[PDB]
Motif scaffolding. Structure first.
Motif, short mmCIF file in Angstrom:
data_model
loop_
_atom_site.label_atom_id
_atom_site.label_comp_id
_atom_site.label_asym_id
_atom_site.label_seq_id
_atom_site.Cartn_x
_atom_site.Cartn_y
_atom_site.Cartn_z
N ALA A 8 0.86 -1.19 0.00
CA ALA A 8 0.00 0.00 0.00
C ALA A 8 0.91 1.24 0.00
O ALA A 8 1.86 1.33 0.75
N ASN A 9 0.65 2.18 -0.87
CA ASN A 9 1.40 3.46 -0.79
C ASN A 9 0.67 4.31 0.25
O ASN A 9 -0.49 4.73 0.07
N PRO A 10 1.32 4.74 1.34
CA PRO A 10 0.63 5.48 2.38
C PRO A 10 0.26 6.90 1.99
O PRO A 10 -0.39 7.56 2.76
N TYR A 11 0.81 7.41 0.89
CA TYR A 11 0.58 8.80 0.45
C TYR A 11 -0.58 8.89 -0.54
O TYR A 11 -0.90 10.01 -0.81
N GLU A 12 -1.22 7.79 -0.92
CA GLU A 12 -2.41 7.84 -1.81
C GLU A 12 -3.50 8.58 -1.04
O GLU A 12 -3.80 8.27 0.15
N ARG A 13 -4.08 9.54 -1.71
CA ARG A 13 -5.28 10.25 -1.24
C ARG A 13 -6.35 10.24 -2.32
O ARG A 13 -6.06 10.35 -3.53
N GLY A 14 -7.60 10.20 -1.88
CA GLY A 14 -8.75 10.31 -2.79
C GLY A 14 -9.00 9.08 -3.63
O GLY A 14 -8.33 8.05 -3.58
N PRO A 15 -10.10 9.12 -4.42
CA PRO A 15 -10.52 7.96 -5.19
C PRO A 15 -9.66 7.61 -6.39
O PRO A 15 -8.90 8.44 -6.89
N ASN A 16 -9.78 6.42 -6.87
CA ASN A 16 -9.04 6.03 -8.11
C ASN A 16 -9.46 6.96 -9.23
O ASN A 16 -10.65 7.26 -9.42
N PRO A 17 -8.52 7.55 -9.97
CA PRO A 17 -8.83 8.66 -10.85
C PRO A 17 -9.40 8.23 -12.19
O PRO A 17 -9.20 7.13 -12.68
N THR A 18 -10.19 9.15 -12.72
CA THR A 18 -10.78 9.12 -14.07
C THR A 18 -10.49 10.45 -14.75
O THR A 18 -10.23 11.49 -14.09
N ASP A 19 -10.73 10.49 -16.07
CA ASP A 19 -10.69 11.79 -16.76
C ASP A 19 -11.69 12.74 -16.11
O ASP A 19 -11.34 13.89 -15.88
N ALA A 20 -12.95 12.32 -15.81
CA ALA A 20 -13.87 13.22 -15.14
C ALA A 20 -13.35 13.75 -13.82
O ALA A 20 -13.56 14.95 -13.54
N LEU A 21 -12.73 12.92 -13.00
CA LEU A 21 -12.26 13.41 -11.72
C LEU A 21 -11.26 14.57 -11.96
O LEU A 21 -11.26 15.53 -11.21
N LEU A 22 -10.41 14.44 -12.96
CA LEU A 22 -9.35 15.46 -13.15
C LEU A 22 -9.81 16.66 -13.97
O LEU A 22 -9.16 17.71 -13.89
N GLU A 23 -10.90 16.55 -14.73
CA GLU A 23 -11.44 17.64 -15.57
C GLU A 23 -12.52 18.42 -14.83
O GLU A 23 -12.87 19.50 -15.27
N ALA A 24 -12.98 17.96 -13.67
CA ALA A 24 -13.97 18.68 -12.87
C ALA A 24 -13.44 20.02 -12.43
O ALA A 24 -12.22 20.20 -12.30
N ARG A 25 -14.35 20.97 -12.13
CA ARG A 25 -13.88 22.28 -11.63
C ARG A 25 -13.31 22.20 -10.23
O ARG A 25 -12.42 23.00 -9.85
N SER A 26 -13.66 21.16 -9.48
CA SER A 26 -13.11 20.91 -8.15
C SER A 26 -12.77 19.43 -8.02
O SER A 26 -13.53 18.60 -8.56
#
Length: 263
Positions: A1-19
């Motif tokens: 497990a990488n202890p520095y992982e934060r937040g959900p597994n990413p998608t294009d939508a997650l990264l293109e959202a305004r927040s």
């Protein structure tokens, strides 16, 4: 497990959202309180945890308002971020490098306990617009312990960044007339070592001022780079390697990298 992982597994939508997925609070840094820079705003996740920390510099004649959106967006993906004002608006790149370093030391040592308790002081990054981007390259060359650098439409009279050993994403603007990519961004990228993790993203249909307002491409790849290198988060490698499609009918004008990146 990488202890520095934060937040959900990413998608294009997650990264293109305004927040991003994290709610954010802000702390003002007055010019009177700021030691070695002009003050600024710290954006931080409300969720109590430790996160990497990022300092962002504006460019010549620029104020913190020119880079505020990007501080808030990055913090919302799980980072503590300071957007600075410089001592004067006319400060040169190498002065901005020192002010970035001072802003990192401010977040670690002089911000509120709410902010300091959310920082992993071992995992730091620097970014900047224009002369601020030149400052990011200068400080990265001096501090191989930084985890990432992201110069945005960078300006610097020094073309030779062969000493940089920090994972560096340079974002250029195709139509830039202030820091033209032929004389600034591309020579900077080409001088970085082939043996580091590095990338060059040249925006299509962009001026020098593209970084100064919300921009889906700048926010997606800035956050993917910080996640990959500040958090060692290999969930984000997918966005960087092989990266956005370029040329005719692409997302960007050009994308170069040293993919695959060492883990």
């Amino acid at each position: 497990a990488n202890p520095y992982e934060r937040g959900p597994n990413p998608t294009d939508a997650l990264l293109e959202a305004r927040s991003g997925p994290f709610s954010v609070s802000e702390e003002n840094v007055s010019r009177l309180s700021a030691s070695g820079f002009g003050g600024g705003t710290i954006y931080y996740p409300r969720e109590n945890n430790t996160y990497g920390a990022v300092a962002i510099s504006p460019g010549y004649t620029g104020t913190e308002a020119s880079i505020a959106w990007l501080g808030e967006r990055i913090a919302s993906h799980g980072f503590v971020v300071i957007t600075i004002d410089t001592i004067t608006t006319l400060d040169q790149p190498d002065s901005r490098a020192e002010q970035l370093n001072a802003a990192l030391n401010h977040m670690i040592n002089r911000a509120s306990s709410t902010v300091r308790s959310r920082i992993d002081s071992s995992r730091l990054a620097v970014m900047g617009h224009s002369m601020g981007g030149g400052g990011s390259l200068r400080l990265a060359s001096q501090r191989p312990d930084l985890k990432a650098a992201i110069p945005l439409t960078p300006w610097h009279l020094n073309k030779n960044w062969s000493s940089v050993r920090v994972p560096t994403l340079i974002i250029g603007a195709d139509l830039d007339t202030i820091a033209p990519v032929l004389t600034h961004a591309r020579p900077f990228y080409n001088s970085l070592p082939t043996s580091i993790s590095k990338a060059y993203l040249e925006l299509d249909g962009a001026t020098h001022f593209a970084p100064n307002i919300p921009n889906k491409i700048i926010g997606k790849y800035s956050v993917a780079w910080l996640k990959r290198f500040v958090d060692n988060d290999t969930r984000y490698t997918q966005f960087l390697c092989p990266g956005p499609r370029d040329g005719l009918f692409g997302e960007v004008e050009e994308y170069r990298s040293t993919c695959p990146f060492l883990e």
